[PDB]
Amino acid sequence: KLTIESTPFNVAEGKEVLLLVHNLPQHLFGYSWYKGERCDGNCQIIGYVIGTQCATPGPAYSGREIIYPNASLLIQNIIQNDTGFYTLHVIKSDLVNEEATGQFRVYPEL
Amino acid sequence: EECQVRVGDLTVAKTRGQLTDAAPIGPVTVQALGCNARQVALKADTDNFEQGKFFLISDNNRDKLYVNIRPMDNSAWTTDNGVFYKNDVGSWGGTIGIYVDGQQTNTPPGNYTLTLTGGYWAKDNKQGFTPSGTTGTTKLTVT
Ligand SMILES: *SCC1=CC(C)(C)N(O)C1(C)C
Ligand SMILES: *SCC1=CC(C)(C)N(O)C1(C)C
Ligand SMILES: *SCC1=CC(C)(C)N(O)C1(C)C
């Protein structure tokens, strides 16, 4: 099953976190990252259409979100409000848009 | 800068009977640029929209069926028989689907073209809609 991992799990304020995606399916139409534990629409972070590399920012897009063709998301300048869960929606041209949820925590330094 | 909604074209083979009440026949990943305080709305082309209503038409222009474009359980949008729009402010980024109004009972299909254009909406009921962005021509083919 699609697995989302956060590396590192314990991020510090002022650093970046790489949300690695494991076991990615086929027939990829577009990746969509949302802020929460489910596939919403008003709380979308970013959508990335691999076919044309067409990336469109969502309402929750801060500008620190870097999406890769492997569906992994690298968020830089991590803040305390980043502590929580993140959900990925795998839009496929087969209706099965396999959803997965990951999470990470942030701690202050000095 | 304006409320630009990117609607993509999609051709799929399906029957009118597969449309059982709410059946998402194809997930369209649509994202809206802008609209921080404006309502996002979907309106069909004038060839598929008459009297403030959206519908699909066949090659013989005899069979007319009304279809509502709703979110794939991603958000809450105001349903209208002509222009679909959400009351919630802010941009939108999810998947929309074409839903039939009332079971069609799989009436003899063929080739139906329904052009859906995205954009914004002003106020309510007055029909102040403006298609800005990309237009998506959805083709319904029976196979
Ligand atoms: S998911 C809640 C939410 C909505 C919006 C106003 C776009 N946001 O910035 C957050 C992510 C807090
Ligand atoms: S960027 C989205 C896009 C561009 C174009 C090459 C016209 N396309 O076919 C899609 C809709 C994928
Ligand atoms: S995230 C839940 C969901 C919605 C829809 C697009 C209908 N899906 O196929 C799943 C079940 C992934």
Sheet holding A65-67, edge to edge: A3-7, A17-22, A73-75, A65-67
Q: Which residues pair with A55 in a beta bridge?
A: A48
**Tokens, residue B141:** 């083919």
Ligand nearest to the CA of B4: 2
Q: Report how far residue A44's alpha carbon sits from residue A46's, in angstroms, rounded to the nearest whole number.
A: 6
Cross-chain Cβ contact B94/A59 below 8 Å: no
Q: Report how far residue B136's alpha carbon sits from residue A11's, in angstroms, rounded to the nearest whole number.
A: 42
**Tokens, residue A100:** 């997965």
Element holding B33 (H helix, E strand)? strand B28-33
Instruction: Give the distance (Å) from ligand 3 centre to CA of residue B74.
Output: 9
Q: Report how far residue A36's alpha carbon sits from residue A38's, in angstroms, rounded to the nearest whole number.
A: 6
According to DSSP, the β-strands at A3-7 and A17-22 are antiparallel
Comparing CB atoms, the residue among A39, A59, A89 nearest residue B90 is A59
Is the minimum distance from the CB of A94 to ligand 3 under 6 angstroms? no
Ligand 1-lining residues (CB < 6 angstroms): A 35-36, 43, 59-60; B 90
Q: Which sign, positive or negative, has the C-alpha torsion A3, A51, A58, A98?
A: negative
Comparing CB atoms, the residue among A30, A46, A56 nearest residue B33 is A56
Query: What are the φ/ψ torsions at residue B84 (nearest 5 degrees)?
Result: -95, 130
Angle, CA A35 vertex, CA B31 and CA A107 arms, to 5°:
140
CATH architecture of B1-143: Sandwich (2.60)
Q: Quick one: CA torsion of B102, B106, B108, B114, rounded to 10 degrees?
A: 50
Q: What is the CA radius of gyration of chain B?
A: 14
Nearest residue to B94 via CA among A56, A96, A13: A56
DSSP letter at A43?
Answer: T
Burial B88-127 (b: 16+ CB within 10 A, else e): eebbbbbbbbbbbbeebeeeebeebbbbbbbbbbeeeeee
Omega before residue A8 within 30° of 0, cis: yes
Beta strands (DSSP E) in chain A are 3-7, 10-12, 17-22, 28-34, 44-49, 54-57, 65-67, 73-75, 84-92, 99-107
Cβ-contact A92, A98 below 8 angstroms: yes
Largest interatomic CA distance in chain B: 44
Cross-chain Cβ contact A41/B74 below 8 Å: yes
- Cβ neighbours for B101, distance < 8 A, ≥ 6 positions apart: B65, B66, B67, B68, B81
**Tokens, residue B107:** 């009436």
**Tokens, residue A78:** 């991590």
Domain range summary for chain B, segments of one domain joined by +: 1-143
Q: Report how far residue A63's alpha carbon sits from residue A74's, in angstroms, rounded to the nearest whole number.
A: 11
Q: Method of determination? A: NMR
Q: Report how far residue A60's alpha carbon sits from residue B7's, in angstroms, rounded to the nearest whole number.
A: 20
Q: Quick one: CA torsion of A92, A16, A4, A108, rounded to 10 degrees?
A: -140
CATH architecture of A1-110: Sandwich (2.60)
Angle, CA B123 vertex, CA B118 and CA B128 arms, to 5°:
50
Cross-chain Cβ contact A97/B95 below 8 Å: yes
Q: Report how far residue B4's alpha carbon sits from residue B7's, in angstroms, rounded to the nearest whole number.
A: 9
Query: What are the φ/ψ torsions at residue A100 (nearest 5 degrees)?
Result: -145, 150
Is the minimum distance from the CB of B134 to ligand 2 under 6 angstroms? no
Q: Report how far residue B46's alpha carbon sits from residue B115's, in angstroms, rounded to the nearest whole number.
A: 9
Q: Which residues pair with B35 in a beta bridge?
A: none
- Three-class secondary structure assignment of B35-53: CCCCEEEEEECCCCEECCE
Residue B51's Cα: distance from chain center in Å?
A: 16
Q: Report how far residue B119's alpha carbon sits from residue B25's, in angstroms, rounded to the nearest whole number.
A: 22
The whole-angstrom distance between A109's CA and the closest CA on chain B is 34
Q: What is the CA radius of gyration of chain A?
A: 13
Count how many residues are written for chain A. 110
Domain range summary for chain A, segments of one domain joined by +: 1-110
Pocket test for ligand 1, best of A32, A37, A43, A81 (most atoms within 8 A of CB): A43
Position A52, amino acid: T
Neighbours of B52 (CB within 10 A): 13
Q: Does B29 touch chain A (CB under 8 A)?
A: yes
Cβ-contact A79, B29 below 8 angstroms: no
